[PDB]
Ligand SMILES: O=C(O)CCCCCCCCCCOC(=O)S
Ligand SMILES: O=C(O)CCCCCCCCCCOC(=O)S
Ligand SMILES: *SCCCCCCCCCC
């Protein structure tokens with residue numbers, strides 16, 4: 001006869017700021033075409049990618065994540081002392097343990113703060129932004145870091161005619177906290193674990209670890225399957241996300257799909273019936289596919305180029321590995 | 335100027351059931367005393383562990399989590415079609431991508447429900463329980479599975495002498511959903527990234543992949559440092575947990591700390607100042623340390639022995655790698 005107490009946070013939460021960090025090494029298509037039988041033009045028309053960034057040998061998903069946070073914090077007018085938790089979303093923290101979240105908190109100056117690694121393929125940001133919003137409104141935190149980071153280079157098979165020109169590096173973090181107006185709509189999510197092997201690590205670490213001198217694992221992609229699924233299934237995912245926020249297709253100002261493939265995104269923009277003048281993220285051009293980091297990296301780009309304004313109503317749609325998606329309507333940060 | 339929908343879910347949320355799964359191969363202390371010369375008594379005196387369970391080769395974290403859910407659903411008298419999401423917490427899913435969750439989802443027949451993998455070491459489950467509860471109170475999901483799964487087996491160095499006897503395999507899933515009574519307390523969580531190296535994979539997979547002629551990675555433990563940290567710092571954490579749930583230490587009926595080491599958990603009990611008759615989870619004896627899976631496996635055991643009853647007021651304390659910790663006051667399920 002003693003009811004467990006419940007706590008409560010803020011009603012309205014929003015993206016206070018975005019920070020982005022891309023490693024300085026520019027990898028061209030022609031440099032990629034080195035061990036590939038295709039050209040710059042073939043790669044740009046089929047994907048929309050021109051150049052992408054590769055990290056340094058000493059760099060890691062965590063170090064870039066630490067770096068993205070600082071910048072977001074700086075853009076937020078906030079210190080590490082003002083943060084209550086940090087979620088790292090990544091698919092390329094190359095340790096089973098420890099998780100990257102503590103390390104990032106540690107180097108940021110706030111070693112004691114709550115946090116975890118959330119891994120859900122390319123869709124990892126939608127879930128982690130979703131988890132923050134709910135935790136903050138829940139009262140477990142007031143202000144929170146959600147960082148997407150990905151070191152994909154070391155996982156690329158440079159002879160792989162189907163995916164080498166695709167994956168890249170970068171880290172972008174957002175600051176989530178209380179806001180006057182409601183800023184982040186309901187998370188709309190789900191998956192398709194039937195197609196789990198569409199984007200995968202071909203060999204598992206333990207099997208590989210039993211015969212290290214045999215073929216090592218790489219990232220593999222059954223592209224047409226991914227094209228079909230994404231191109232035809234995310235339209236509703238976007239509609240469900242807009243519906244839960246109480247908004248209309250013609251009300252979206254910025255559209256931030258996962259930067260997987262520009263032809264896919266072209267089909268979604270048309271399927272989503274947005275305004276003819278809706279600003280549509282195209283960070284694919286000089287960032288490539290950065291999985292968990294893709295969307296917040298895309299957001300920053302548009303804010304930096306001034307194509308998007310802070311406070312613009314925006315739709316987010318994450319899609320990729322596991323075959324799992326996540327989508328939310330948000331105001332633009334910064 | 336368009337508004338974003340402010341939505342609500344159910345306020346009161348609890349653990350409906352718990353479903354555990356344990357590998358049939360019983361590996362003993364004297365069996366671990368064939369490679370490396372210690373003693374079954376030495377291990378028992380120092381850790382509290384007598385035997386442990388190692389999973390089969392055709393078994394995995396992913397596979398064991400699926401079976402635990404089958405059982406969690408079975409004990410709540412429910413169906414995969416009643417579940418809106420799964421959270422697989424783990425440290426031994428031996429793929430960067432795809433996530434375990436969607437696979438676990440499809441194998442239960444839950445077509446494309448939301449789901450992600452949460453990593454925060456031994457404390458992953460406390461984090462996962464708290465995240466799910468957040469999502470239901472926000473309205474993102476109604477009923478959810480949360481599964482700590484682990485196959486630490488293949489990660490153990492048989493020459494360890496410091497931790498070969500510590501780690502073991504298993505899974506345990508809880509169903510989280512609406513209840514009339516508030517069943518899960520506010521999440522008390524945190525970390526210590528300065529001490530990230532205390533429990534770590536010693537070599538990263540890329541580095542190892544890059545150098546197959548060198549040593550393979552293994553799980554490493556800095557015992558003394560972990561003992562010092564967990565046994566003197568975790569009292570305050572539980573104290574913070576009980577404070578948030580509005581309960582006095584003498585109101586606790588069951589204590590389920592992470593099954594790291596009996597001697598640690600022994601000192602915890604005294605610092606925590608619970609009742610003399612308070613039920614203390616000792617699953618460690620024939621289970622060992624199962625990271626993420628530990629606590630819900632430790633829950634299931636107390637319910638199986640009848641040492642704990644459904645509705646009992648439990649104090650959970652997860653702690654370990656990342657040097658991260660998670661705690662909350664709950665009601666026992668089943
Ligand atoms: O037609 C061919 O023979 C090859 C054409 C392949 C280029 C088209 C891009 C691959 C689609 C991958 C999209 O999924 C993700 O980006 S993930
Ligand atoms: O240093 C002390 O006072 C205790 C001696 C260390 C005991 C031997 C190893 C157990 C380490 C504690 C458990 O670590 C985890 O499983 S986490
Ligand atoms: S859509 C997210 C893709 C994530 C790829 C990371 C897996 C790399 C394989 C390791 C060799």
Ligand SMILES: *SCCCCCCCCCC
Pocket residue numbers: 096097425426455456457486489533534535536551552553554624625626654655
């Ligand atoms: S909660 C403590 C268990 C740590 C899990 C990591 C397993 C080590 C991987 C080495 C290959």
